RNA sequence: UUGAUUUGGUGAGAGG
DNA sequence: CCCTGTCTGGCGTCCTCTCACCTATGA
DNA sequence: TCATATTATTACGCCAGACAGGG
């Protein structure tokens, strides 16, 4: 094909074939003319090298080249490599009915639906709109319909809302690593040009909103719409397939809204008043007569389902707060009140959704995940939880700790001038006292943040955990840890030079005080190493996933029982410290090999082919069972696949 | 004192440390390099003169003619820079070289030549540099980026661990020339010394010694010291200097002088060495088992029999001693091979060597270098004597000889460019010393070992390539030269020099397209130091340590401005104060510290000098004399930051900006940010689009002025003075007399570049910021460019930001924006698109430019003329027609008429047409010809008249010393004026002098206007080939919308999520809504706490601005304003600014206070910024709460947010990642040729690549049918997709799959080998 | 039967 | 003949966007 | 325009896999 101009941009294979044919014509003419031996040996040798260069170029000595010094691409180089036919056109293809744009939040969504712009919706659904327009009778030929949607008249938007309605789409973030990076939603049309994506689902995609882009794909046929609704819908992916942990965990704003809501303070409006239900708890919060955290006896009615599928009501007075009753208005029936009675950080809300999924199933857990997200966003908005310059409280003891460390390094260097100690022991003593002073500065600031609030109630003072903003952002587990809040208030440790060894003079200034020049330069050593490590680590991570899915590639659950009695011996793992990973983490949802004897004497505690779900694992933990002989995939007797028992639990089902 | 645009709005400058050295001109690398390349510099160094003095005089091989050189020159460019960018030509200059051919007779080395000839011949055109550091290569504006490469000269590298798999270190030594062959020496784990040349095969290294006419005895004289065994009374005693016994085991009985010194068994200590030196012990009698392992040094022959006893480098046995003892060689020289220190590496290499003499050494080297083709005496000797020893093909430069003498601890630094014998022998000796223990290796990241190439050096190397090709051509033509019938252009050819230099300036890895969307981005793409390029490392291979920051980067390379991704730390950006050394290294300023008193003299150092000295820190407290106020101060000695005494230091850092670059020293509160977020902040700050209304960062660093001036986007005044201000077209500046030349009366007319295309489709536009009749000084700014506000640097705009969660709309990093941001057009940026249309003659006749557009009805003829091409300016969108450009015989006629792309709108701002000499439609082409024709003459006379008016007045003005008669001077009006004779009196020649001016003015205006018409009267100017050349410039105006990307200066990225109404915003109790709500949860994790101090200090800045706006709106007489302005400019600790405010004439207070009513601008410098107590104290001067936090109500519910929130002003930028350049969708359109799958991209209307990991993700589910349509029907299978489109539009969602086409393409490509791949049974 | 060329390939820069 | 340096081949992350630049010869 | 047919740089880092050398 010619490019834009008047010349033909010719392929490399035409150069290869044209040279082989030029040389072959020369060799036929020389064998006509009866040239001597050395001429036809060079001629046949040039033909041999020409054919060998056509088939696999460059496997012989230095590869031939046309323009300019770059070698030209042969047939084997049309097959092999990252850009051959397998990895570039047969395993991955470019795809019609597909789109791509920048994502944004839209928190009004339910977690089975996503926002999708009107312009992308009218472009991706052109044939469905054509079929709908031809069914009504508005137009006749196909051309008329293409002019109608090229003009975008007033009647095609009703056609578009009637082709969207129950038709899922596959949203896909561009580095898809696991299967939760392709999820199917239902579109809700957006005035705009940005895909609105429900926030909880973001923790599955590893999608923040700093400029990310996602692709939309349309399931055309009817089996694909049913696969998008029944396998790939976003309500169906609420557990990560790598383990048992929920992947629709509430990420960052909503845990701050909950941690500010369900908490307490030793005096507020409406301290110690009594309330006849959670409805008037929210009515007292809204009218302006109590506070969101003010401890209060309420009367709640928790439904415990202690019978066989029957929900029994028990109503009682819990000494709780106002916010815990307001959050109890959203909890479904079966969960007990003690799931909200605590302070609800991030681990606690994750196990709240996990206990809701284990007890009440899927549909209350989907609707309760949405109600969690809505009430977290609403009371985080009502919280006004800012961040200031005064929130990072400097320890008053920090300067005396630094001067005591400076006196200690002065003593060690005065011994170094008089030669009493060795150089390695000097370096070790300096790193040890700066580690000790760093830990003391961190404990000073951590006391000064975790219990700084001291407010009286009806008399003398009484202390409590603080409502400092950076401390709630750390204690809630929203964003922040001990180390980051340590570096914003206490000293930021002993940064290390790229030699791998540590630097004996630390960075005694945090970020609220100013770093001077040398301290920031040592900091840049420590951070440039981290950016280089991530930007080169990602290649090995991706190539590891490729090698793993191409060694796996074949193995499909293809039976129901291999009919064996062999399986590996799951014990808890112990390195030499305290018992690291308990047996309930290793033998959860894996089918036992032989029947586990109860630890007393010769009892059939569990039978020999039972899946060990949570109830069986609790009856294992009560009896303190030593180790379980359980069925493993490597002991499966199935030819060409893995039987259904030797795999185990479904992990997301 | 201040200049007059400095008194407009003087920024409140925090900063305690007095700066001693002002910031150098930020584009000096590019400009000094290219000014070195083109300059007439006698003594030859460096430049084009070095190239001509290397290549000339050319003499042929005794051809008795010798073309020599005289002088070169560069004429005027035929195209000035603007019309050069418009037309598409290079911005070049013709290189006029004088060449003098002299031709000899027979037998004239000394004889006078028989004939000469000389002419100013023309070779190439070299591209000149624009005054801002850019080129214009083919219409587009490109930048050569300075390379960072390994210096020429020896490097002793180790590779300690990875080879041999045994923990044994190697030690190699590379002699890197600037031009020529690479010579490396290297150990191997058998402890033998090996040479290799140009990474070829491995030769044992002493063969190169045997190639330098060294016998074995001379080599053993060099690398070993002699131990003397004297044949004596018994057992052949030994001379023993006691140094040689250091650290070894006494094998025998050590006794002398009748006294037993050291017995057998104990090791020899240094006290025993002191005993032997005190006892004067040299000669001791050895056993016969001591010599039975040693090695002879030189040769010995049996004298009477006349044959050889032993060759040099032979180990000794007892019968060999019985051979040599009985002959009569009394002295025996042995090689001291210490296992600890003095190893026998050369000797064992000589045992590996298969050669014996010089000739076989050269034959083996020639068989290494060029294999197959035979090794004869002449050929191998010419090879080895031109490998390193001729001035042509091997040349360590001055840098290389300096590094080569410095790494060998030589005294001198200047020497010859080639190597010698002694240099190779010294490199081998230093390598052996490093193996022995003494001396150490070099590291490669050390910036004293790392040179910078720049524009002049790279263009000079390419020009030298072109000159050696043209001298091989001149040697070709001259031996075939017949005389005298040629003159020097049948010999010389302008083609290879121009070809090579356009090859470099067009298609190189460093001549690259300028990131031009921002004044910052221009000025920080020109200051870039790339590790990549030719001769340097690559992106996808190396490494870990060259991507990492080394302690010699302090003040030479920015530590924090490097792009994240595949090339981190290869694309380093240069620091603020760092110049370039004479040799090309990076030297940075320091303040010389003789004693306690830190002197204000500066002195530049590089990293091979910074290690020796002790260099202080920039911020160490010194008071009123330069004495360090402490008795101990943090310094750094040899790359190690440590605490030293008060009086030991020799240098101090100049200023505290000097570590970082001009991208990341514009970030205020840098010292409070994390390093990662400062990196992301600087890299995004390069990417900002210029807004429609430029707006002055309230929290800046004061480096905005230097960046906005030094990047040439503003019209800085050349000569000071007043103003005439026609300005609609140009600023006209009358020049004050002191800066004004005696002749050339002269007033400066500045050209404002109005709305035009940048390289990133943004809009570069200049607007005058001076009024009419207003004084300006030299160096002052006159016209504000893109993203500038009164000479400062305004990338983004400053907006009222609340930190709070607001109903989830700012969840991860999103940003929630009011409607007051989008109503005011305060981010509504202007983009410009160039669209070309050509009507090339592909085939079947030429294409045509006519409105008579076919099939398509009166929906073609609309935004055009009555008969062709888009008219001028309307609101064109997508699917319109701009240039009717369609052929007949291409019913069978078609629609190639360049239209408007899908999704864009805009206004046609400009239409250019230098089309195929004929474009005129009706008669428009010649219609405008007369318009410009009459235009030229008008201005030509006008300008003359303008000067005439000034001259006429000047005539009368001077008419006083030679006729002041006012009533006798107003005779003729436009006729004559002076009808008197001044003669002398006090020299007023001045009348006669001015008479010549007007006389010459009219006389030159005619000629000036004569060429004007000549130039005017023309078809048009462009190249050939291309026929119809119509370029149409749209200008879309994009506002802001849900999906764009905004960011501050600290790394806080955001995709603006909801564009709220004004009512729903969080308003404080005063009533004002907040503009933009960010999210506080980003701040504890991303530890960029500097955005909060910018928020509080910007809140205080607008607090002062609101206070001045009240004092000036509710208008007060200027005493209260000058008192409040004086309080605002004093404010707090000891600073540098204070102000001299009572000298502002009672009006410059008011104009300042008119320019401060939007907020008082505050300079918070980089590491010496504003402390927190001064932020609180400034928040107390304004009436704002001290905590920085205001209680805010909610616009929805009207009720207070608990726990008061932070509101302030952050300077937020709009990055050029706009959402309606990313939105794309595809149902069905065009595909590729080879494959049946859809095309890729957006400009091609193509679909999404459903890659490999998405296929694995669908396999991970049970999506077997979704994947089947995802790779068969939607993508590739042609029968499947046509049946599917018809099945969809019938109302039948069902796929008829078939087989993909690209798999049959795979079958034919595999089958086109000798491979029979098939498809089996049904 | 009612219309047309980038993918090809290199180099440089950018986003997640 | 079993260890052994040494040499040769074969890997090295996905998705996207913008721009420019493309063989010499020649009676 | 229409056939003629290929030369004067080096500077990754493992990690298997095959090969001549020698105790
Ligand atoms: Mg991101
Ligand atoms: Zn099995």
Curated annotation (Swiss-Prot), chain B:
GO terms for cellular component: DNA-directed RNA polymerase complex. GO terms for molecular function: DNA binding; DNA-directed RNA polymerase activity; ribonucleoside binding. It comes from the Bacteria. It catalyses: RNA(n) + a ribonucleoside 5'-triphosphate = RNA(n+1) + diphosphate. One of its GO terms (biological process) is DNA-templated transcription. The keyword Transit peptide does not apply. SUPFAM superfamilies: beta and beta-prime subunits of DNA dependent RNA-polymerase. Keywords: Acetylation, DNA-directed RNA polymerase, Nucleotidyltransferase, Transcription, Transferase. CDD domains: RNA_pol_B_RPB2. Coiled coil: none annotated. Gene3D superfamilies: 2.40.50.100, 2.40.50.150, 3.90.1100.10, 6.10.140.1670, DNA-directed RNA polymerase, beta subunit, external 1 domain, DNA-directed RNA polymerase, subunit 2, domain 6, RNA polymerase alpha subunit dimerisation domain, RNA polymerase Rpb2, domain 2. The modification N6-acetyllysine is found at residues 1002, 1180. Its EC number is 2.7.7.6. Pfam families: RNA_pol_Rpb2_1, RNA_pol_Rpb2_2, RNA_pol_Rpb2_3, RNA_pol_Rpb2_45, RNA_pol_Rpb2_6, RNA_pol_Rpb2_7. It is an enzyme of class 2 (transferase). DNA-dependent RNA polymerase catalyzes the transcription of DNA into RNA using the four ribonucleoside triphosphates as substrates. The RNAP catalytic core consists of 2 alpha, 1 beta, 1 beta' and 1 omega subunit. When a sigma factor is associated with the core the holoenzyme is formed, which can initiate transcription. Belongs to the RNA polymerase beta chain family. This is DNA-directed RNA polymerase subunit beta. The gene is rpoB.
């Amino acid at each position: 094909v010619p490019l834009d101009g008047g010349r033909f941009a010719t392929s490399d294979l035409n150069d290869l074939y044209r040279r082989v044919i030029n040389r072959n014509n020369r060799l036929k003419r020389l064998l006509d003319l009866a040239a001597p031996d050395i001429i036809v040996r060079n001629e046949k040798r040039m033909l041999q090298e020409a054919v060998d260069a056509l088939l696999d170029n460059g496997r012989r000595g230095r590869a031939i080249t046309g323009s300019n010094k770059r070698p030209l691409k042969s047939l084997a180089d049309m097959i092999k490599g990252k850009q051959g036919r397998f990895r570039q056109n047969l395993l991955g293809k470019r795809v019609d009915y597909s789109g791509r744009s920048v994502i944004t939040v839209g928190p009004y969504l339910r977690l089975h639906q996503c926002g999708l712009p009107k312009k992308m919706a009218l472009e991706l659904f052109k044939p469905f709109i054509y079929g709908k327009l031809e069914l009504r009778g508005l137009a006749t030929t196909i051309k008329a319909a293409k002019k109608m949607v090229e003009r975008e008249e007033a009647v095609v938007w009703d056609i578009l809302d009637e082709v969207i309605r129950e038709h899922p789409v596959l949203l896909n973030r561009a580095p898809t690593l696991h299967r939760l990076g392709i999820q199917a939603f239902e579109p809700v049309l957006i005035e705009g040009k940005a895909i609105q994506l429900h926030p909880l689902v973001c923790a599955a995609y590893n999608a923040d909103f700093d400029g990310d882009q996602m692709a939309v794909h349309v399931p055309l046929t009817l089996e694909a719409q049913l696969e998008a609704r029944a396998l790939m819908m976003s309500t169906n992916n609420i557990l990560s397939p790598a383990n048992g942990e929920p992947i629709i965990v509430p990420s960052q704003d909503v845990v701050l809204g909950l941690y500010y809501m369900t908490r307490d303070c030793v005096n507020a409006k409406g301290e110690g008043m009594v309330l006849t239900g959670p409805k008037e708890a929210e009515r007292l919060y809204r009218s302006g007569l109590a506070s969101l955290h003010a401890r209060v006896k309420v009367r709640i009615t928790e439904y415990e389902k202690d019978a066989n599928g029957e929900l029994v009501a028990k109503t009682s007075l819990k000494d709780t707060t106002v916010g815990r009753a307001i959050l109890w208005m959203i909890v479904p029936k079966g969960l007990p009140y003690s799931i909200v009675n605590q302070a609800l950080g991030k681990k606690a809300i994750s196990k709240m959704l996990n206990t809701c999924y284990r007890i009440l199933g899927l549909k209350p857990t989907v609707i309760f995940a949405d109600q969690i997200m809505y009430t977290g966003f609403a009371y985080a908005a009502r919280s006004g939880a800012s961040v200031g310059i005064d929130d990072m409280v400097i320890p008053e003891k920090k300067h005396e700790i630094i001067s005591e460390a400076e006196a200690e390094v002065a003593e060690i260097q005065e011994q170094f001038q008089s030669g009493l100690v060795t150089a390695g022991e000097r370096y070790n003593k300096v790193i040890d006292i700066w580690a000790a002073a760093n830990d003391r500065v961190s404990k000073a600031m951590m006391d000064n943040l975790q219990t700084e609030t001291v407010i009286n109630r009806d008399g003398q003072e009484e202390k409590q955990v603080s409502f400092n903003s950076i401390y709630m952002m750390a204690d809630s587990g929203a964003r922040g840890s001990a180390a980051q809040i340590r570096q914003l208030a206490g000293m930021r440790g002993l940064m290390a030079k790229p030699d791998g060894s540590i630097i004996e003079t630390p960075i005694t200034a945090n970020f609220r005080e100013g770093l001077n020049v040398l301290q920031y330069f040592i900091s840049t050593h420590g951070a440039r190493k981290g950016l280089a490590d991530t930007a080169l680590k990602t290649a090995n991570s991706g190539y590891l996933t490729r090698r793993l899915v191409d060694v796996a590639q074949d193995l499909v659950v293809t039976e129901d029982d291999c009919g064996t009695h062999e399986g590996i011996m799951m014990t808890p793992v112990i390195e030499g410290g305290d018992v690291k990973e308990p047996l309930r983490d290793r033998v959860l949802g894996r089918v036992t090999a032989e029947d586990v004897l109860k630890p007393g004497t010769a009892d059939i505690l569990v039978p020999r082919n039972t899946l060990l779900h949570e109830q069986w694992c609790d009856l294992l933990e009560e009896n303190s069972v030593d180790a379980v002989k359980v069925r493993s995939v490597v002991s499966c007797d199935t030819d060409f696949g893995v039987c259904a028992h030797c795999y185990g639990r479904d992990l997301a089902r | 004192v201040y200049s007059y645009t400095e008194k407009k709005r003087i920024r409140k400058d925090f900063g305690k440390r007095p700066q001693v050295l002002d910031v150098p001109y930020l584009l000096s690398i590019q400009l000094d390099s290219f000014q070195k390349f083109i300059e007439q510099d006698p003594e030859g160094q460096y430049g084009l003169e070095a190239a001509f003095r290397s290549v000339f005089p050319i003499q042929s091989y005794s051809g008795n003619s010798e073309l020599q050189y005289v002088s070169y020159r560069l004429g005027e460019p035929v195209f000035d820079v603007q019309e050069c960018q418009i037309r598409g030509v290079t911005y070049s200059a013709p290189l006029r070289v004088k060449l003098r051919l002299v031709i000899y007779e027979r037998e004239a080395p000394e004889g006078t030549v028989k004939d000469i000839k000389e002419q100013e011949v023309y070779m190439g055109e070299i591209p000149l540099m624009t005054d801002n550091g850019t080129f214009v290569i083919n219409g587009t504006e490109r930048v050569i980026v300075s390379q960072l490469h390994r210096s020429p000269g020896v490097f002793f590298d180790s590779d300690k661990g990875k080879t041999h798999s045994s923990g044994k270190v190697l030690y190699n030594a590379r002699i890197i020339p600037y031009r020529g062959s690479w010579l490396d020496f290297e150990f191997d784990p058998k402890d033998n010394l090996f040479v290799r040349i140009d990474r070829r095969r491995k030769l044992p290294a002493t063969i190169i010694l045997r190639a330098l006419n060294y016998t074995t005895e001379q080599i053993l004289d060099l690398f070993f010291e002699k131990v003397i065994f004297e044949i004596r009374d018994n057992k052949l005693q030994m001379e023993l200097v006691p140094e040689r016994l250091r650290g070894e085991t006494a094998s025998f009985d050590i006794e002398a002088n009748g006294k037993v010194y050291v017995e057998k068994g104990r090791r020899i200590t240094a006290r025993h060495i002191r005993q032997l030196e005190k006892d004067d012990v040299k000669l001791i009698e050895v056993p016969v088992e001591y010599i039975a392992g040693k090695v002879v040094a030189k040769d010995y022959i049996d004298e009477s029999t006349g044959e050889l006893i032993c060759a040099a480098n032979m180990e000794l046995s007892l019968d060999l001693l019985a051979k040599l003892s009985q002959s009569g060689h009394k002295r025996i020289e042995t090689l001291f091979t210490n296992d600890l220190d003095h190893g026998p590496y050369i000797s064992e290499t000589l045992r590996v060597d298969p050669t014996n003499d010089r000739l076989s050494a050269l034959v083996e080297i020639y068989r290494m270098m060029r294999p197959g083709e035979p090794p004869t005496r002449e050929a191998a000797e010419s090879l080895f004597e031109n490998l390193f020893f001729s001035e042509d093909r091997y040349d360590l430069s001055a840098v290389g000889r300096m590094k080569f003498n410095r790494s060998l601890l030589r005294e001198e630094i200047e020497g010859s460019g080639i190597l010698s014998k002694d240099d190779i022998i010294d490199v081998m000796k230093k390598l052996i010393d490093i193996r022995n223990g003494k001396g150490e290796v070099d590291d490669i990241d050390h910036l004293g070992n790392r040179r910078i190439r720049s524009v002049g050096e790279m263009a000079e190397n390419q020009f030298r390539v072109g000159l050696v090709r043209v001298e091989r051509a001149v040697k070709e033509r001259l031996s075939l030269g017949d005389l005298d019938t040629l003159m020097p252009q049948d010999m010389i050819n302008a083609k290879p020099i121009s070809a090579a230099v356009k090859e470099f300036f067009g298609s190189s890895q460093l001549s690259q397209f300028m990131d031009q969307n921002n004044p910052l981005s221009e000025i920080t793409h020109k200051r870039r130091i790339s590790a990549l390029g030719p001769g340097g490392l690559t992106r996808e291979r190396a490494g870990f340590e060259v991507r990492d920051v080394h302690p010699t980067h302090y003040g030479r390379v920015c530590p924090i401005e490097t792009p994240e991704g595949p090339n981190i730390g290869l694309i380093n950006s240069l620091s603020v104060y760092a110049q370039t050394n004479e040799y090309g290294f990076l030297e940075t300023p320091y303040r010389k510290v003789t004693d306690g008193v830190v002197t204000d003299e500066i002195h530049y150092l590089s990293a091979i000098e910074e290690g020796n000295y002790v260099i202080a820190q920039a911020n160490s407290n010194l008071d009123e004399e330069g004495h360090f106020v402490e008795d101990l101060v943090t310094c750094r000695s040899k790359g190690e930051s440590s605490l030293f005494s008060r009086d030991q230091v020799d240098y101090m850092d100049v200023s505290t900006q000097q570590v970082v670059s001009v991208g990341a020293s514009l970030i205020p509160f840098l010292e409070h940010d994390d390093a990662n977020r400062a990196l992301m902040g600087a890299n995004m700050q390069r990417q900002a689009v210029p807004t429609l209304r430029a707006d002055k960062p309230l929290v800046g660093t004061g480096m905005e002025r230097a960046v906005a001036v030094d990047s040439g986007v503003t019209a800085v005044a050349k000569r000071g003075g007043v103003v005439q201000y026609v300005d609609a077209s140009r600023i006209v500046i009358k020049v004050n007399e002191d800066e004004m030349y005696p002749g050339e009366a002269g007033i400066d007319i500045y050209n404002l570049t109005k709305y035009t295309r940048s390289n990133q489709n943004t809009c570069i536009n200049q607007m005058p910021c001076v009024s009419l009749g207003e004084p300006v000084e030299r160096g002052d700014v006159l016209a504000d460019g893109p993203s500038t506000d009164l000479g400062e640097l305004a990338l983004g705009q400053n907006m009222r930001v609340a930190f709070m969660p607001w109903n989830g709309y700012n969840f991860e990093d999103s940003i929630l924006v009011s409607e007051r941001v989008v109503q005011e057009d305060r981010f509504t940026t202007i983009h410009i698109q160039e669209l070309a249309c050509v009507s090339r003659d592909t085939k079947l006749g030429p294409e045509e430019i006519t409105a008579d557009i076919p099939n398509v009805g009166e929906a073609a003829l609309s935004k055009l003329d009555e008969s062709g091409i888009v008219y001028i300016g309307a609101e064109v969108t997508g699917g319109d027609i701009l240039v009717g450009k369609v052929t007949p015989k291409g019913s069978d006629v078609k629609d190639s008429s360049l239209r408007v792309p899908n999704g864009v709108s805009g206004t046609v701002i400009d239409v250019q047409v230098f089309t195929r000499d004929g474009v005129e439609k009706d008669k428009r082409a010649l219609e405008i010809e007369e318009m410009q024709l009459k235009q030229a003459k008008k201005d030509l006379s006008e300008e003359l008249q303008i000067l005439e008016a000034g001259l006429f007045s000047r005539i009368r003005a001077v008419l006083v010393a030679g006729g002041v008669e006012a009533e006798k001077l107003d005779k003729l009006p436009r006729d004559r004026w002076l009808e008197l004779g001044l003669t002398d009196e006090e020299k007023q020649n001045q009348l006669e002098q001015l008479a010549e001016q007007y006389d010459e003015l009219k006389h030159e205006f005619e000629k000036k206007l004569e060429a004007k018409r000549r130039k005017i009267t023309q078809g048009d100017d462009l190249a050939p080939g291309v026929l119809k050349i119509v370029k149409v410039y749209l200008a879309v105006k994009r506002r802001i919308q849900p999906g764009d990307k905004m960011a501050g200066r600290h790394g806080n990225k955001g995709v603006i999520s909801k564009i709220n109404p004004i009512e729903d915003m969080p308003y404080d109790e005063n009533g004002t809504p907040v503009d933009i709500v960010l999210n506080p949860l980003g701040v504890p994790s991303r530890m960029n706490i500097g955005q909060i101090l910018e928020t509080h200090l910007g809140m205080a800045a607008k607090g002062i601005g609101d206070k001045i706006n009240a004092m000036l709106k509710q208008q007060q007489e200027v005493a209260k304003l000058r008192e409040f302005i004086q309080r605002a400019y004093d404010l707090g600790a000891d600073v540098r600014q204070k102000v001299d405010l009572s000298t502002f004439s009672d009006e410059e207070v008011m104009r300042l206070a008119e320019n401060l009513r939007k907020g008082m601008p505050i300079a918070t410098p980089v590491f010496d910024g504003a402390k927190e107590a001064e932020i609180k104290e400034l928040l107390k001067l304004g009436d704002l709460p001290t905590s920085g936090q205001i209680r805010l109500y909610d616009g929805r519910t009207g009720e207070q947010f608990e726990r008061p929130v932070t509101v302030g002003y952050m300077y937020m930028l709009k990055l050029n990642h706009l959402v309606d350049d990313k939105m794309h969708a595809r149902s069905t359109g065009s595909y590729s040729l080879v494959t049946q799958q859809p095309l890729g991209g957006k400009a091609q209307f193509g679909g999404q690549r459903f890659g490999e990991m998405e296929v694995w993700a669908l396999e991970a589910y049970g999506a077997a049918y979704t994947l089947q349509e995802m790779l068969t029907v939607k993508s590739d299978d042609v029968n499947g997709r046509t049946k599917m489109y018809k099945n969809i539009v019938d109302g039948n969602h069902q796929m008829e799959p078939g087989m993909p086409e690209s798999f049959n393409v795979l079958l034919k490509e595999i089958r086109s080998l000798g491979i029979n791949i098939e498809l089996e049974d049904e």
